[PDB]
Amino acid sequence: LIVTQTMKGLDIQKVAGTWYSLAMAASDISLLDAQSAPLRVYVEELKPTPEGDLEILLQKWENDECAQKKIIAEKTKIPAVFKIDALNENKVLVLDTDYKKYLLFCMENSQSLVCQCLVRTPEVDDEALEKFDKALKALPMHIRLSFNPTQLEEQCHI
Amino acid sequence: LIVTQTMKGLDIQKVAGTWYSLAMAASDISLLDAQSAPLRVYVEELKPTPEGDLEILLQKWENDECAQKKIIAEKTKIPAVFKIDALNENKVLVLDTDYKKYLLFCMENSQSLVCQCLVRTPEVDDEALEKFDKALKALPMHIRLSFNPTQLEEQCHI
Numbered sequence: 001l002i003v004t005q006t007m008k009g010l011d012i013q014k015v016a017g018t019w020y021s022l023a024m025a026a027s028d029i030s031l032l033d034a035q036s037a038p039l040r041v042y043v044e045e046l047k048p049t050p051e052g053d054l055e056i057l058l059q060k061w062e063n064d065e066c067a068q069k070k071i072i073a074e075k076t077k078i079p080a081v082f083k084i085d086a087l088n089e090n091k092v093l094v095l096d097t098d099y100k101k102y103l104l105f106c107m108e109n110s111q112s113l114v115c116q117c118l119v120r121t122p123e124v125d126d127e128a129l130e131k132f133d134k135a136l137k138a139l140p141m142h143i144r145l146s147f148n149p150t151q152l153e154e155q156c157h158i
Numbered sequence: 159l160i161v162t163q164t165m166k167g168l169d170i171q172k173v174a175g176t177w178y179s180l181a182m183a184a185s186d187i188s189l190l191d192a193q194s195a196p197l198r199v200y201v202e203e204l205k206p207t208p209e210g211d212l213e214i215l216l217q218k219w220e221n222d223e224c225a226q227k228k229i230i231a232e233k234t235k236i237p238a239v240f241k242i243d244a245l246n247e248n249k250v251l252v253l254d255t256d257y258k259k260y261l262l263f264c265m266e267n268s269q270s271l272v273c274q275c276l277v278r279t280p281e282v283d284d285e286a287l288e289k290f291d292k293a294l295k296a297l298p299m300h301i302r303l304s305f306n307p308t309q310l311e312e313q314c315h316i
C-alpha cells in the first residue's frame with residue numbers, strides 16, 4: 001500500500017471509450033526510460049464489462065515494433081481498485097476522473113508504481129496535468145514523461 | 159531565447175567544487191530517455207578559471223561505459239551566461255544558486271533545452287527541487303528525472 005488517493009463514487013461504466021496517455025510517471029526511472037520499458041504503455045480504449053470488470057486496450061513497444069495489447073482488469077470489493085493477473089499481484093487504482101475530460105490512475109505491485117494522466121482528446125490539458133502533479137506530490141516518483149498533440153496521434157507516441 | 163530566469167549578481171568563483179545532478183529535465187524526451195542520450199550528463203565538479211571561464215567535469219554514458227569528460231564554458235558579457243563550443247551555438251545559463259546548497263542551470267541551443275538541479279551533497283533536498291520545479295513551470299519540458307542518494311554516489315548514477 002502506497003497510493004491512498006482514490007476516487008469516491010466511481011461509476012466504472014462512465015469511463016468507457018477513447019483515452020490518451022497525456023503524461024506518465026513512475027517510482028523508478030527504468031520503468032519508463034526506454035521505448036521498450038516494461039511499463040511504458042499508451043492507453044487506447046477502456047471497456048468495462050457488464051459484470052464490472054475493465055478491459056483495457058493499449059499500445060506497447062516490444063520487439064522493435066508498436067504492438068497492440070488487450071488486458072483485463074478484474075474488479076474488487078472497492079469500486080476504484082482492480083486486479084491485473086501477472087506473476088506478482090498487480091493492482092490498478094482510479095484516483096480521480098471527471099469522466100468527460102480526464103482520468104488519473106496508478107498501477108502498483110503488492111513498492112513500485114506507475115501513474116498516468118489520461119485525457120479524452122489529443123490536447124494539452126494544463127488543468128488535468130495540475131491534478132496529476134498534485135496527486136504525485138504525495139508519491140515517490142523519479143521519472144515523469146509528457147507528450148505533445150502530434151505524438152498523441154501517433155502509434156506508441158512516436 | 160526561451161529561458162529568462164537568470165541569476166542576478168552571480169559570483170562565478172563561488173560555484174567552484176563538487177556538485178551532484180540531483181534532477182534533470184528537457185524539452186524533448188529523446189534528449190534524456192536512454193542512458194546514452196546525448197544530454198544525459200552527470201556533473202562532478204565546477205572549476206571557474208582566473209579569466210572567468212567555467213570548466214566543467216562530468217560523467218556521460220557513451221560506448222557502453224561511464225566516461226569522464228571535460229568541457230570548457232566560455233564567459234560572455236552577462237555573468238550568468240556562458241557559451242560552449244559545439245557545431246551549433248550552445249548557451250548555458252545559471253538561473254539561481256545559493257552557492258552552498260544548490261545551483262539551477264539550463265543549457266539551450268540558439269528551441270531545445272536541458273536543465274538540472276545541482277546540489278552540494280548526496281541528499282534529496284526538497285527545497286532545491288521546489289525551486290527547480292518552480293523555474294521549470296515557465297518552460298516547455300517533457301521529461302523529468304530525479305535520482306536517489308544511492309545513485310548519486312555511483313558513476314553515471316547507476
Ligand SMILES: CCCCCCCCCCCC(=O)O
Pocket residue numbers: 038039040041043054056069071073084092093094103105107
Ligand atoms: C482506469 C484504468 C486504467 C487501466 C490501465 C492500466 C494498464 C495496465 C498495464 C498492464 C501492464 C503491462 O501490460 O505493461
Ligand SMILES: CCCCCCCCCCCC(=O)O
Pocket residue numbers: 196197198199201212214227229231242250251252261263265
Ligand atoms: C553552472 C554551470 C553548469 C554547466 C554544466 C553544463 C554541462 C554542459 C554539457 C555539454 C554538452 C555535452 O557534452 O553533453
